[PDB]
């Protein structure tokens, strides 16, 4: 007779709420992919993580959120979640997401995660694809705040990204014409000192230039970032014909595997140790006196073990003059580099980044790159 009573009725209601999290399609946050989302937008019908729920809470005309475990649910609300959910959302709100569009993860800055949510649910850019034209048309112009090479100041400059000319250019007759093949971009809000800060890099003469820009409008800077990825995508299809689209997407733009301060010495190993900001981009290791420098003090190619590159914990017994005690030795065919890290946790992370590069076979295109150093 237990089935006939009000306690059973309630237990079934409670089980129905929790059951929605045990469907495979709802195993990860709809927006950033974090595992085991505990929150739901009951107007959009998605299951999202605590962090994403806060972003949603901030578009209250579109999304209302509450906890699947801790808040009360009306029957109709549970039935709404059950008829929607994360797979449904993917088919609706991610119906027409361009292959080049950057999909954020929990590690990404607030700007990326917020604008992903706004593009999907607020602006509905992937439901109504004409809204994608600002960054999908192969031409984009606009003004951005650009840091001076050496002067610390941000000034308004017109940028033009033109796939037809194969370049990003800007004017201060352009001041610079930067070929797409040599461009990368990564959001760096903490380094730049602005939440919408984007770092754009350009390789010429085997020397990387850092350009540091922002826009007051978060949508506009993220649209520049994705426009640059679109341009990169079209360039790569041309340089690598018969590479699949999926093959190309990881190459469109590259976040840095690691950055941070280390001390280094010179080619003799006796010169004295100097603090530098290091950035590891794929196989290119760049070191700067300051992170916002336009140019590196030096750049090192980290090739594969098949070409005689290796990485070791520690320093040789000879070594003197350093004061951070956690050493890393990089052996290249031409030079032994000695870097010192302030902590063991950082040493471990640096060795792991260098080891990943050494352990991976070189790609065809990387042989000519190596040749330039
Ligand atoms: O000034 P110092 O007299 O103490 O020593 C220089 C310093 O260590 C440089 O590091 P950096 O400033 O470029 O980080 C190094 O260049 P490198 O970058 O090759 O290690 C240069 O060697 P070199 O210019 O290679 O001969 C050294 O002479
Ligand atoms: Zn999330």
UniProtKB/Swiss-Prot annotation:
Boundaries of every PH domain copy: 137-233, 255-359
Sequence ranges assigned to domain Arf-GAP in this UniProt record: 15-134
Expression tissues: Expressed at highest levels in brain and at lower levels in peripheral blood leukocytes.
Residue positions, PTM Phosphothreonine: 279
PTM info: Phosphorylated by PRKCA, PRKCI, PRKCZ and PRKD1 in vitro.
Assembly mode: Interacts with PRKCA, PRKCI and PRKCZ. Interacts with the N-terminal region of PRKD1.
Stated name of the protein: Arf-GAP with dual PH domain-containing protein 1
Gene: ADAP1
């Amino acid at each position: 007779s237990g089935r006939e009573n009000l306690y059973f009725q309630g237990k079934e209601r409670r089980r129905a709420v929790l059951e929605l999290l045990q469907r495979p399609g709802n195993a990860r946050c709809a927006d950033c992919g974090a595992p085991d989302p505990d929150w739901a937008s009951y107007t959009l019908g998605v299951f999202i993580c605590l962090s994403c729920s806060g972003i949603h809470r901030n578009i209250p005309q579109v999304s209302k959120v509450k906890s699947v475990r801790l808040d009360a649910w009306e029957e109709a609300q549970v039935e709404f979640m059950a008829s929607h959910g994360n797979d449904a959302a993917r088919a609706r709100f991610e119906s027409k997401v361009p292959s080049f569009y950057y999909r954020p993860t929990p590690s990404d800055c607030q700007l990326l995660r917020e604008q992903w949510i706004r593009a999907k649910y607020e602006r509905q850019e992937f439901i109504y694809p004409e809204k994608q034209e600002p960054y999908s048309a192969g031409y984009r112009e606009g003004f951005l705040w650009k840091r001076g090479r050496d002067n610390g100041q941000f000034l308004s400059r017109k940028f033009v990204l033109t796939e037809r000319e194969g370049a990003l250019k800007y004017f201060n007759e352009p001041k610079a014409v930067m070929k797409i093949e040599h461009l990368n971009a990564t959001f760096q809000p903490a380094k730049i000192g602005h939440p919408h800060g984007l770092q754009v890099t350009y390789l010429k003469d085997n020397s990387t230039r850092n350009i540091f820009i922002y826009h007051e409008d978060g949508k506009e800077i993220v649209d520049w970032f994705n426009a640059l990825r679109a341009a990169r995508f079209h360039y790569l299809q041309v340089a690598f014909p018969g590479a699949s689209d999926a093959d190309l997407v990881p190459k469109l733009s590259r976040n840095y595997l690691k950055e941070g301060y280390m001390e280094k010495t010179g080619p003799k190993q006796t010169e004295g140790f100097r603090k530098r900001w290091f950035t590891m981009d794929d196989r290119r290791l760049m070191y700067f006196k300051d992170p916002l420098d336009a140019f590196a003090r030096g750049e090192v190619f980290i090739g594969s073990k098949e070409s005689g590159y290796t990485v070791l914990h520690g320093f040789p017994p000879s070594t003197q003059g350093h004061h951070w005690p956690h050493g890393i030795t990089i052996v290249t065919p031409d030079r032994k580099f000695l870097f010192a890290c302030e902590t063991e946790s950082d040493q471990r992370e640096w060795v792991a980044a260098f080891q990943k590069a050494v352990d991976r076979p070189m790609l065809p295109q990387e042989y000519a790159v190596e040749a330039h150093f």
